[PDB]
Nucleic acid binder design. Structure first.
Ligand SMILES: [Mg+2]
Ligand SMILES: [Mg+2]
Ligand SMILES: [Mg+2]
Ligand SMILES: [Mg+2]
Ligand SMILES: [Mg+2]
Ligand SMILES: [Mg+2]
Ligand SMILES: [Mg+2]
Ligand SMILES: [Mg+2]
Ligand SMILES: [Mg+2]
Ligand SMILES: [Mg+2]
Ligand SMILES: [Mg+2]
Ligand SMILES: [Mg+2]
Ligand SMILES: [Mg+2]
Ligand SMILES: [Mg+2]
Ligand SMILES: [Mg+2]
Ligand SMILES: [Mg+2]
Ligand SMILES: [Mg+2]
Ligand SMILES: [Mg+2]
Ligand SMILES: [Mg+2]
Ligand SMILES: [Mg+2]
Ligand SMILES: [Mg+2]
Ligand SMILES: [Mg+2]
Ligand SMILES: [Mg+2]
Ligand SMILES: [Mg+2]
Ligand SMILES: [Mg+2]
Ligand SMILES: [Mg+2]
Ligand SMILES: [Mg+2]
Ligand SMILES: [Mg+2]
Ligand SMILES: [Mg+2]
Ligand SMILES: [Mg+2]
Ligand SMILES: [Mg+2]
Ligand SMILES: [Mg+2]
Ligand SMILES: [Mg+2]
Ligand SMILES: [Mg+2]
Ligand SMILES: [Mg+2]
Ligand SMILES: [Mg+2]
Ligand SMILES: [Mg+2]
Ligand SMILES: [Mg+2]
Ligand SMILES: [Mg+2]
Ligand SMILES: [Mg+2]
Ligand SMILES: [Mg+2]
Ligand SMILES: [Mg+2]
Ligand SMILES: [Mg+2]
Ligand SMILES: [Mg+2]
Lengths: 100, 88, 275, 68, 53, 114
RNA sequence: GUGGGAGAGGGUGGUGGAAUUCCCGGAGUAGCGGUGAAAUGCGCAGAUACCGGGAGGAACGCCGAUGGCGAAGGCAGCCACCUGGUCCACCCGUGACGCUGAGGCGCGAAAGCGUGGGGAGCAAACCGGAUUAGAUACCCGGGUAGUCCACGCCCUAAACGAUGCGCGCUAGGUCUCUGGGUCUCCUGGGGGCCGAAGCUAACGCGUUAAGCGCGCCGCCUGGGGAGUACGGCCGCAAGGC
C-alpha cells in the first residue's frame, strides 16, 4: 500500500461513447489490481509541446491512488494495452518542496 | 523493504528483557532477517554484486557477535542458532 | 535447458537431449490420436520422390487445432502439456468448459490451469486467438492463418513467432520468422505469443543413430557418385565440382532463385528476407 | 533576470504546471543553467528531474528551432 | 605545484574570454586538466554578466 | 505558381547549398557553390555562398516567388554571406530561422569529429 | 534502537524524444562529397539540397560542474519494482563484542573467447585514392570481426592519488556538497584550494600528511638478460599466476 499518481493521455478525436468506455476500462482495471482511487484531476484536452501519436491535440486524465507496491507495474502494462491509450506514467507520491 | 512492524515483531521476541533494543541476540536476529531477505533477493537477481558485498559484511558481523556470545555464554548461544535455524 | 552427458561413450560426449521440463502428462489423449501412415518418401506411384527417408520410430498423429475460431467465446483450461513426436513444438491439451477437448501448439509461457479463449472479444494474452485486426500492433503472435478461415500456416515451429508491423487497409503487415514482410488479411486468426521450446535448436544429435531414429537415412554426396548418377559424379581420384555446382537433376544449386516469377502471391509480399 | 525572483513561492515537485515550469527553459527549450535560474544546488536537481517528466508528458518541449 | 600556473593561465584565459559580449563558449585547450579551468573559467565570467547586468 | 514561399540554406565547411521551396515544402529551384563556376575548396567560401543564394533567388523570381522564410541548417563559412545576400536579392525575407539538427547524444561520430 | 537526508551505488521490467542510416511517395536538377590541395567514391538508371510516411539499432543533448555515489573496476533520458552502502539527530539498548589479515572466497575497465541473438553509427583486418624517394602510416572514399543483449569464460592495465588499512595527537585562511542546530554563525560528514609547526634528495606534502606515534599486512635490495626459461597451477584459446 503506497500512493502513486497515474497520468493517462488519450485520444483527442474520440467519441463521447468511446472516451467513456476507455475511461470505464481504466477505472475497471484499477479496481482489479487493488488500486483504491484517492482523487481525480481530469483536465480534458489541454494541447501539447510535440505531436504524440502524430496528434498535436491530446486528452489528459490523472488519478492519485493507493495500491499494493508489488502490483503497479503490471497495471501500467494493462493500461497501455489499449489502442487509444497513448501515454501512461505512474509516479510515486512525494510531498511537495518549494522555492522562495 | 522490511517494515517497522516486522522489525518490532522480531525485536520484541528476541529482546532479553522487556525494553531491550541492542543485545547481541537481538542484533543477530535483526541481521538474520535482513540477511535472509538479501539471500532471496540474490537467488533471484544473481547479477547484483554490489548488494552481494553487503551480504558478506552482514554475514561477517553476525559471525563476530555470535562468537562473542558463545565465549561469554554457551547455552544462550546454542539457544539462538537453534531458535533462528542457523549455523549449518 | 539441453541435458548434456558425460562421455562414457564416444557419441555420448557431444550428444544432447531436451529437458522435457514443461511436460506434465506423458501418454496422449486416446480420443485425439490417429495413426500416421509412414511413406518412406514414396508417393502413390511407389516411387521415391524424396530421398534419404525412412525407418523412423513409429508415431501416432496427435490431431491439432489450427482453426480455433471453430469455437469462439468458449473459454478453456490448460489440462496438460505433452510431447508431440510430429513437430518441433510442444502441444497443450485444452479442456474447454464445453467438455470438448482439443490440442494446440503450446506457446511459450503457458502454464497448466491457465485460461485461454479465442475471438475478437478476447483479452490479449499468451494462448488466445484473435483475428489479426484486433491484435495490437507490435505484439508477437504465432500460428497465423494466411488466408481467412483456411487454417494456421505461418509460425508453427519451435521457437518461431511473427510480429505485427502495422495495418494497411483490409490487411495487416507481418514480419514472418524468415524476415519476410508480408501483407496478411486482417480477418486471419493468429494466436498471441511465441511458439515454445525455443531451445530445440540447441540440440546436438550426437551420433548417426539418432538421425536414423528420426527417420533420416544417410545422404550421399554427388561427389561420391558416378556420372550416370549425378553431375558431380566421377573423375579419377577425388575431384572439385568442375562446373557450377548442381542438383542431381542438373539445376544449379548455389544462388539460383527458384520461386515462380509471376505468382499472384506477390503484390502481398512487401520485402523478401533477410540477410 | 533571476527567474526564482521574477516568480513567487512555488513547488517544483509538481510537474504539471506548464505555466510555472516553461519560464525555466531558454527559447530553444534547453534547461536553463544555474546562472540564469537563480536556483540553488539541491533545487536545480529537483527541478530538471521534474521538468523531464513533464517533457515526457508532452507539456514542455524537448526542443525548438531558433528564430531571428 | 608549479603547474598551478598553467591552470592559472588557462582559467584566466577563460575568465577574460568569458567576459566579452560576445564570447565563444567553444574555444579551449585539448588537454583535460587545463580545459576544466578555461570552460569553468568561461563560466564565472559568463555568470557575472548575468549578476550585475 | 507561388509568390509566398520559403528557402532552405544548407551550410557546411565544404560548401553551401540553397533550395527555394513552396510553402508546402516541395522545392522550386535549388543552387549551390558548385552550381556557379566553382570546384573544390572554392565552393566552401562566403563569396560563393553569395552567388548561390542569389542564383537561388534570381531563379525563384523567374517563377514569381516574392516572399520567403529563411530556414537555416549548418555551420558554414559561407553561411553569413548567404542569408545576407538573400535580403539583398530583392526578396521579402519574411522571417529568419536556424533549424540545425543536433543529436541528444546519438550515434558516435567519425574519428574526425571525436 | 528511534527518528530523518542526499546521491549517475547495483539488479529486473517498461517507456520518451533528438539525430544517423536504409526503404516507399512527393517536389526538383547538375552536381554532390571530400581535402592543405586533390582524387577515388556517389550522381541524368535523377544523386546532394527540401517535404511527408515507415523500419531499425545504438547513444541519452540542455540540467552538468573542479558537482554527486561506490571498496575498486566503475556508474547518467524518465518510470516503477527488488536492493547495498553512507550521513545526521536522540543519548534509549548491548558491554570491548575491537583493529588487521598469510592462505581461501567474491568482485574486477577495455580487448579477447564459447553458444545464440542483434547490427543504425563507428571501426582493427582488408580494398581503393592520395602524400611520399618508398608510405605495408598520418589524410580521403569504402569495409569485416568487434562495438549492443543473454548466458558462460578470461583476470589484465598509466586497475594511478603511481600514496595498504585502523585509531590518536599536532595553526588557520578560503568555496563547495550534504545533514543538524538558540541560523550573521555554530556544528557532523564528504570534496578541492593556500598554507603553522613539522617532513623531504629536491620537487613538493601538510587535520583528505608524504607530520608526530602505535598495530597489522603487503612489497624493495644495481641495470640488462626478463616478467624470459624450467617446473607447477589455471584457461577452450589467447594467455595468466
Ligand atoms: Mg526428464
Ligand atoms: Mg472408439
Ligand atoms: Mg495407392
Ligand atoms: Mg500401382
Ligand atoms: Mg548449434
Ligand atoms: Mg540431413
Ligand atoms: Mg554425405
Ligand atoms: Mg566412385
Ligand atoms: Mg551426368
Ligand atoms: Mg542407373
Ligand atoms: Mg546418359
Ligand atoms: Mg566433375
Ligand atoms: Mg587428383
Ligand atoms: Mg571421384
Ligand atoms: Mg528449376
Ligand atoms: Mg558538404
Ligand atoms: Mg537510490
Ligand atoms: Mg531497458
Ligand atoms: Mg525518428
Ligand atoms: Mg525519393
Ligand atoms: Mg525524410
Ligand atoms: Mg577512473
Ligand atoms: Mg537505498
Ligand atoms: Mg546509559
Ligand atoms: Mg573483465
Ligand atoms: Mg568487452
Ligand atoms: Mg562474442
Ligand atoms: Mg592503402
Ligand atoms: Mg578511414
Ligand atoms: Mg566509414
Ligand atoms: Mg579472432
Ligand atoms: Mg591518475
Ligand atoms: Mg579513493
Ligand atoms: Mg603497481
Ligand atoms: Mg591491504
Ligand atoms: Mg606504510
Ligand atoms: Mg539547516
Ligand atoms: Mg570536513
Ligand atoms: Mg567518496
Ligand atoms: Mg597545498
Ligand atoms: Mg617520502
Ligand atoms: Mg623481485
Ligand atoms: Mg604479462
Ligand atoms: Mg611452463
Amino acid at each position: 500500500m503506497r500512493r502513486y499518481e497515474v497520468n493517462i493521455v488519450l485520444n483527442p478525436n474520440l467519441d463521447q461513447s468511446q472516451l467513456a468506455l476507455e475511461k470505464e476500462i481504466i477505472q475497471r482495471a484499477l479496481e482489479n489490481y487493488g488500486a483504491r482511487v484517492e482523487k481525480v484531476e481530469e483536465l480534458g484536452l489541454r494541447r501539447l509541446a510535440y505531436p504524440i501519436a502524430k496528434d498535436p491535440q491530446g486528452y489528459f486524465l490523472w488519478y492519485q491512488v493507493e495500491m499494493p507496491e508489488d502490483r503497479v507495474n503490471d497495471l501500467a502494462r494493462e493500461l497501455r494495452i489499449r489502442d487509444n491509450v497513448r501515454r501512461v506514467m505512474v509516479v510515486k507520491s512525494q510531498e511537495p518542496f518549494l522555492a522562495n | 523493504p522490511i517494515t517497522k512492524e516486522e522489525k518490532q515483531k522480531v525485536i520484541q521476541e528476541f529482546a532479553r528483557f522487556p525494553g531491550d533494543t541492542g543485545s547481541t541476540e537481538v542484533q543477530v536476529a535483526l541481521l538474520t532477517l535482513r540477511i535472509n531477505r538479501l539471500s532471496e533477493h540474490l537467488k533471484v537477481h544473481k547479477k547484483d554484486h554490489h548488494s552481494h558485498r553487503g551480504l558478506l559484511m552482514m554475514v561477517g558481523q553476525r559471525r563476530r557477535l555470535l562468537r562473542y556470545l558463545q565465549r561469554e555464554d554457551p547455552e544462550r548461544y546454542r539457544a539462538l542458532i537453534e531458535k533462528l535455524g542457523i549455523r549449518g | 535447458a539441453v541435458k548434456k552427458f558425460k562421455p562414457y561413450t564416444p557419441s555420448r560426449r557431444f550428444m544432447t537431449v531436451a529437458d522435457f521440463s514443461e511436460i506434465t502428462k506423458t501418454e496422449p489423449e486416446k480420443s485425439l490420436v490417429k495413426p500416421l501412415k509412414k511413406t518412406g518418401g514414396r508417393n502413390n506411384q511407389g516411387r521415391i520422390t524424396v530421398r534419404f527417408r525412412g525407418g523412423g520410430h513409429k508415431r501416432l498423429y496427435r490431431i491439432i487445432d489450427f482453426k480455433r475460431w471453430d469455437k469462439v467465446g468458449i473459454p478453456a483450461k490448460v489440462a496438460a502439456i505433452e510431447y508431440d513426436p510430429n513437430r518441433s513444438a510442444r502441444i497443450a491439451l485444452l479442456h474447454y468448459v464445453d467438455g470438448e477437448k482439443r490440442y494446440i501448439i503450446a506457446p511459450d509461457g503457458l502454464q497448466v490451469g491457465q485460461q485461454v479463449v479465442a475471438g475478437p472479444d478476447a483479452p490479449i494474452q499468451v494462448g488466445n486467438a484473435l483475428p489479426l485486426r484486433f491484435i495490437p500492433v507490435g505484439t508477437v503472435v504465432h500460428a497465423v492463418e494466411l488466408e481467412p478461415k483456411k487454417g494456421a500456416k505461418l509460425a508453427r515451429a519451435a521457437g518461431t513467432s511473427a510480429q505485427i508491423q502495422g495495418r494497411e487497409g483490409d490487411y495487416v503487415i507481418l514480419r514472418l520468422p524468415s524476415g519476410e514482410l508480408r501483407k496478411v488479411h486482417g480477418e486471419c486468426y493468429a494466436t498471441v505469443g511465441a511458439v515454445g521450446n525455443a531451445d530445440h535448436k540447441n540440440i546436438v544429435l550426437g551420433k548417426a543413430g539418432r538421425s536414423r531414429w528420426l527417420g533420416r537415412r544417410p545422404h550421399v554426396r554427388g561427389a561420391a557418385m558416378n556420372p550416370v548418377d549425378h553431375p558431380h559424379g566421377g573423375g579419377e581420384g577425388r575431384a572439385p565440382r568442375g562446373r557450377p555446382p548442381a542438383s542431381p537433376w542438373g539445376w544449379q544449386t548455389k544462388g539460383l532463385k527458384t520461386r515462380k516469377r509471376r505468382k499472384p502471391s506477390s503484390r502481398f509480399i512487401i520485402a523478401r528476407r533477410k540477410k | 533576470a533571476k527567474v526564482k525572483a521574477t516568480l513567487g513561492e512555488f513547488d517544483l515537485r509538481d510537474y504539471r504546471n506548464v505555466e510555472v515550469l516553461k519560464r525555466f527553459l531558454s527559447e530553444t527549450g534547453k534547461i536553463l543553467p544555474r546562472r540564469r535560474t537563480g536556483l540553488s544546488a539541491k533545487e536545480q536537481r529537483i527541478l530538471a528531474k521534474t521538468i523531464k517528466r513533464a517533457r515526457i508528458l508532452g507539456l514542455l518541449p524537448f526542443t525548438e528551432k531558433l528564430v531571428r | 605545484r608549479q603547474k598551478r600556473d598553467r591552470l592559472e593561465r588557462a582559467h584566466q584565459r577563460g575568465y577574460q574570454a568569458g567576459i566579452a559580449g560576445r564570447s565563444k563558449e567553444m574555444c579551449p585547450y585539448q588537454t583535460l586538466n587545463q580545459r576544466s579551468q578555461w570552460l569553468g573559467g568561461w563560466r564565472e565570467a559568463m555568470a557575472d554578466r548575468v549578476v550585475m547586468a | 505558381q507561388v509568390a509566398s514561399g520559403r528557402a532552405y540554406i544548407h551550410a557546411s565547411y565544404n560548401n553551401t547549398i540553397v533550395t527555394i521551396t513552396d510553402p508546402d515544402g516541395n522545392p522550386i529551384t535549388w543552387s549551390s557553390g558548385g552550381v556557379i563556376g566553382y570546384k573544390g575548396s572554392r565552393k566552401g567560401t562566403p563569396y560563393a555562398a553569395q552567388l548561390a543564394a542569389l542564383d537561388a533567388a534570381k531563379k525563384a523570381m523567374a517563377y514569381g516567388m516574392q516572399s520567403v522564410d529563411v530556414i537555416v541548417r549548418g555551420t558554414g563559412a559561407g553561411r553569413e554571406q548567404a542569408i545576407r545576400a538573400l535580403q539583398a536579392s530583392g526578396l521579402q525575407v519574411k522571417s529568419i530561422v536556424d533549424d540545425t539538427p543536433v543529436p541528444h547524444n546519438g550515434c558516435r561520430p567519425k574519428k574526425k569529429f571525436r
